[PDB]
């Protein structure tokens with residue numbers, strides 16, 4: 001359902017959000033225009049997802065409904081649960097960030113929001 005390889009097309013408030021969560025500026029300025037590749041492999045409730053941003057690789061894993069440990073952008077790993085809000089939506093909270101991943105056909109739309117910052121990424125199947 002979710003599986004596939006996707007690249008970012010566009011994103012909103014990368015800089016603002018990454019500062020707020022403590023991404024080191026050095027990595028902000030490099031990664032701000034990288035159109036990153038996300039790779040998803042779903043097997044029923046079981047998901048594995050890789051997020052590559054040049055030379056940075058974040059490999060994560062979770063079963064829906066179950067507790068998981070998600071390595072975040074800074075490197076911090078948080079304990080949380082990811083849930084389906086439908087077949088097309090994946091949904092979670094970590095580090096007070098609300099996260100919504102929406103698949104429509106070939107388009108994955110990810111929104112992360114901390115307080116009033118809404119970090120939105122639009123990715124296309126590749």
Ligand SMILES: CCCCCCCCCCCCCCCC(=O)O
Nearest residue numbers: 027030031036051053054055056110
């Ligand atoms: C090792 C040097 C490479 C520098 C790369 C900078 C990393 C910037 C972060 C890219 C944004 C990707 C955030 C992932 C969000 C998500 O997976 O849902």
Ligand SMILES: CCCCCCCCCCCCCCCC(=O)O
Nearest residue numbers: 038071072073082090099101110121
């Ligand atoms: C590195 C930040 C952790 C990712 C936060 C959400 C984890 C649960 C679901 C994974 C879906 C992420 C889809 C990536 C699409 C994208 O790169 O924008």
